[PDB]
Amino acid sequence: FNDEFSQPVCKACWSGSFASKRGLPTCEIAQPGTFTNVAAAANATFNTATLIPTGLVKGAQAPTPCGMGYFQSSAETTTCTACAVGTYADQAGLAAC
Amino acid sequence: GYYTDVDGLPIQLPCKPGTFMPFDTATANLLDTGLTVDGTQCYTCQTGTFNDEFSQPVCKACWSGSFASKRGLPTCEIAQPGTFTNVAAAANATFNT
Protein backbone atom coordinates (compact mmCIF):
# COMPACT_ATOMS: atom_id res chain seq x y z
CA PHE A 1 0.00 0.00 0.00
CA ASN A 2 0.97 3.65 -0.24
CA ASP A 3 -0.63 6.67 1.42
CA GLU A 4 1.79 9.51 0.58
CA PHE A 5 2.41 11.66 -2.48
CA SER A 6 5.46 11.29 -4.74
CA GLN A 7 6.86 8.03 -3.47
CA PRO A 8 9.51 5.90 -5.21
CA VAL A 9 8.35 2.65 -3.55
CA CYS A 10 5.20 1.24 -2.03
CA LYS A 11 4.93 0.23 1.63
CA ALA A 12 4.56 -3.31 2.92
CA CYS A 13 1.35 -4.18 4.73
CA TRP A 14 2.14 -5.04 8.34
CA SER A 15 1.19 -8.17 10.28
CA GLY A 16 -2.48 -8.06 11.17
CA SER A 17 -3.48 -6.35 7.92
CA PHE A 18 -3.81 -7.16 4.23
CA ALA A 19 -4.12 -5.43 0.86
CA SER A 20 -6.43 -7.42 -1.40
CA LYS A 21 -6.90 -4.86 -4.19
CA ARG A 22 -4.45 -2.89 -6.34
CA GLY A 23 -3.29 0.64 -5.59
CA LEU A 24 -4.82 0.86 -2.13
CA PRO A 25 -4.22 4.13 -0.24
CA THR A 26 -4.66 2.23 3.05
CA CYS A 27 -4.23 -1.31 4.33
CA GLU A 28 -7.30 -3.33 5.27
CA ILE A 29 -7.47 -4.50 8.88
CA ALA A 30 -8.10 -8.18 9.59
CA GLN A 31 -11.46 -8.88 11.18
CA PRO A 32 -12.32 -11.03 14.21
CA GLY A 33 -12.02 -14.69 13.32
CA THR A 34 -9.06 -14.03 11.00
CA PHE A 35 -5.40 -13.07 11.18
CA THR A 36 -2.40 -12.31 8.98
CA ASN A 37 1.15 -13.21 10.02
CA VAL A 38 3.78 -12.53 7.36
CA ALA A 39 7.14 -12.41 9.13
CA ALA A 40 9.27 -11.54 6.09
CA ALA A 41 7.31 -8.41 5.15
CA ALA A 42 9.54 -5.36 5.41
CA ASN A 43 9.81 -1.78 4.20
CA ALA A 44 12.34 -0.38 1.76
CA THR A 45 15.48 1.13 3.28
CA PHE A 46 16.82 4.28 1.65
CA ASN A 47 20.47 4.26 0.61
CA THR A 48 21.51 7.58 2.16
CA ALA A 49 24.31 8.02 -0.40
CA THR A 50 22.33 7.32 -3.58
CA LEU A 51 18.78 8.03 -2.29
CA ILE A 52 17.39 4.80 -3.75
CA PRO A 53 15.37 2.26 -1.70
CA THR A 54 16.08 -1.44 -2.14
CA GLY A 55 14.45 -3.95 0.19
CA LEU A 56 10.67 -4.35 -0.07
CA VAL A 57 8.78 -7.56 0.71
CA LYS A 58 5.01 -7.49 0.25
CA GLY A 59 2.59 -8.40 3.02
CA ALA A 60 -0.53 -10.55 2.86
CA GLN A 61 -3.25 -10.46 0.21
CA ALA A 62 -5.97 -12.31 2.14
CA PRO A 63 -6.49 -13.03 5.84
CA THR A 64 -6.14 -16.54 7.20
CA PRO A 65 -9.22 -17.83 9.03
CA CYS A 66 -8.68 -19.45 12.40
CA GLY A 67 -8.54 -23.23 12.22
CA MET A 68 -11.03 -25.63 13.73
CA GLY A 69 -10.79 -25.60 17.51
CA TYR A 70 -9.30 -22.08 17.51
CA PHE A 71 -10.90 -18.65 17.54
CA GLN A 72 -10.00 -14.96 17.43
CA SER A 73 -11.93 -12.05 18.93
CA SER A 74 -9.71 -9.00 18.37
CA ALA A 75 -9.44 -7.46 14.92
CA GLU A 76 -5.78 -6.59 14.30
CA THR A 77 -3.86 -9.70 15.37
CA THR A 78 -1.34 -12.28 14.17
CA THR A 79 -2.45 -15.47 15.95
CA CYS A 80 -5.36 -17.71 16.91
CA THR A 81 -6.09 -18.68 20.52
CA ALA A 82 -7.47 -22.10 21.40
CA CYS A 83 -10.43 -21.60 23.70
CA ALA A 84 -10.54 -23.18 27.11
CA VAL A 85 -12.55 -26.01 28.65
CA GLY A 86 -16.31 -26.20 28.14
CA THR A 87 -16.22 -24.56 24.70
CA TYR A 88 -15.55 -25.77 21.17
CA ALA A 89 -15.08 -24.38 17.65
CA ASP A 90 -16.08 -26.72 14.82
CA GLN A 91 -15.79 -24.15 12.00
CA ALA A 92 -12.88 -22.25 10.49
CA GLY A 93 -12.97 -18.52 11.15
CA LEU A 94 -15.00 -18.09 14.33
CA ALA A 95 -15.06 -14.75 16.14
CA ALA A 96 -15.98 -16.53 19.38
CA CYS A 97 -16.19 -20.27 19.97
CA GLY B 1 -20.01 -34.06 0.77
CA TYR B 2 -20.86 -35.48 4.22
CA TYR B 3 -18.98 -35.80 7.49
CA THR B 4 -19.24 -37.23 11.01
CA ASP B 5 -16.95 -35.86 13.71
CA VAL B 6 -18.11 -37.73 16.84
CA ASP B 7 -18.79 -41.38 17.56
CA GLY B 8 -22.26 -42.81 17.05
CA LEU B 9 -23.79 -40.00 15.04
CA PRO B 10 -27.20 -41.05 13.68
CA ILE B 11 -26.89 -39.52 10.20
CA GLN B 12 -24.15 -38.03 8.05
CA LEU B 13 -24.11 -34.32 8.32
CA PRO B 14 -23.78 -32.14 5.21
CA CYS B 15 -20.89 -29.76 4.68
CA LYS B 16 -21.96 -26.17 5.18
CA PRO B 17 -22.29 -23.86 2.14
CA GLY B 18 -18.82 -22.35 2.39
CA THR B 19 -17.05 -25.72 2.58
CA PHE B 20 -16.67 -28.97 0.64
CA MET B 21 -15.66 -32.59 1.18
CA PRO B 22 -14.08 -34.66 -1.62
CA PHE B 23 -14.21 -38.39 -2.31
CA ASP B 24 -10.61 -38.87 -1.14
CA THR B 25 -7.20 -37.19 -1.23
CA ALA B 26 -6.28 -38.56 -4.66
CA THR B 27 -9.43 -37.59 -6.58
CA ALA B 28 -9.89 -34.30 -4.71
CA ASN B 29 -10.13 -31.08 -6.69
CA LEU B 30 -8.21 -27.97 -5.61
CA LEU B 31 -6.88 -28.98 -2.19
CA ASP B 32 -3.39 -28.19 -0.99
CA THR B 33 -0.41 -30.41 -0.28
CA GLY B 34 -0.58 -31.33 3.39
CA LEU B 35 -4.38 -31.48 3.61
CA THR B 36 -5.93 -34.95 3.81
CA VAL B 37 -9.59 -35.97 3.87
CA ASP B 38 -10.81 -38.75 6.15
CA GLY B 39 -14.50 -37.86 6.51
CA THR B 40 -14.27 -35.79 9.70
CA GLN B 41 -13.49 -32.33 8.30
CA CYS B 42 -15.13 -30.12 5.71
CA TYR B 43 -12.58 -27.94 3.92
CA THR B 44 -13.07 -24.31 2.96
CA CYS B 45 -13.15 -23.19 -0.67
CA GLN B 46 -9.94 -21.85 -2.21
CA THR B 47 -9.73 -18.20 -3.15
CA GLY B 48 -11.19 -17.73 -6.60
CA THR B 49 -13.73 -20.51 -6.00
CA PHE B 50 -17.00 -20.42 -4.08
CA ASN B 51 -19.81 -22.67 -2.91
CA ASP B 52 -23.37 -21.98 -1.81
CA GLU B 53 -24.95 -25.46 -1.70
CA PHE B 54 -24.91 -28.00 1.11
CA SER B 55 -23.12 -31.35 0.85
CA GLN B 56 -20.92 -30.67 -2.16
CA PRO B 57 -17.88 -32.71 -3.25
CA VAL B 58 -16.24 -29.73 -5.03
CA CYS B 59 -16.27 -25.95 -4.91
CA LYS B 60 -17.60 -23.95 -7.85
CA ALA B 61 -15.43 -21.67 -9.97
CA CYS B 62 -16.15 -17.94 -9.98
CA TRP B 63 -17.27 -16.65 -13.37
CA SER B 64 -15.82 -13.83 -15.46
CA GLY B 65 -17.02 -10.51 -14.12
CA SER B 66 -16.80 -11.59 -10.47
CA PHE B 67 -14.14 -12.71 -8.01
CA ALA B 68 -13.67 -14.47 -4.68
CA SER B 69 -10.91 -13.02 -2.50
CA LYS B 70 -11.51 -14.64 0.90
CA ARG B 71 -11.78 -18.31 1.88
CA GLY B 72 -15.03 -20.26 2.11
CA LEU B 73 -17.27 -17.62 0.54
CA PRO B 74 -20.94 -18.61 0.22
CA THR B 75 -21.21 -16.15 -2.69
CA CYS B 76 -18.93 -14.59 -5.28
CA GLU B 77 -18.13 -10.88 -5.15
CA ILE B 78 -19.19 -8.77 -8.13
CA ALA B 79 -16.50 -6.67 -9.79
CA GLN B 80 -17.19 -2.99 -9.33
CA PRO B 81 -17.29 -0.20 -11.93
CA GLY B 82 -13.75 0.73 -12.85
CA THR B 83 -12.53 -2.88 -12.62
CA PHE B 84 -13.15 -6.21 -14.34
CA THR B 85 -12.22 -9.88 -14.20
CA ASN B 86 -11.61 -12.03 -17.29
CA VAL B 87 -10.34 -15.56 -16.64
CA ALA B 88 -10.94 -17.61 -19.77
CA ALA B 89 -9.78 -20.89 -18.20
CA ALA B 90 -12.27 -20.85 -15.31
CA ALA B 91 -14.57 -23.86 -15.45
CA ASN B 92 -16.79 -25.86 -13.12
CA ALA B 93 -16.09 -29.50 -12.37
CA THR B 94 -17.80 -31.99 -14.68
CA PHE B 95 -19.45 -35.06 -13.18
CA ASN B 96 -18.83 -38.62 -14.32
CA THR B 97 -22.02 -40.63 -14.83
Binding site: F35, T64, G67, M68, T79 | L30, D32, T33, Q41, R71
Partner: peptide, 11 residues
Protein backbone atom coordinates in the same frame (compact mmCIF):
# COMPACT_ATOMS: atom_id res chain seq x y z
CA UNK C 1 -4.95 -24.46 10.86
CA UNK C 2 -7.24 -27.48 10.55
CA UNK C 3 -9.98 -27.31 7.96
CA UNK C 4 -8.36 -24.31 6.25
CA UNK C 5 -7.85 -24.76 2.52
CA UNK C 6 -5.19 -23.15 0.32
CA UNK C 7 -3.05 -23.11 3.50
CA UNK C 8 -2.23 -19.87 5.28
CA UNK C 9 0.14 -17.80 7.34
CA UNK C 10 1.62 -19.80 10.24
CA UNK C 11 0.13 -18.96 13.63
Amino acid sequence: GGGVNQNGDPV
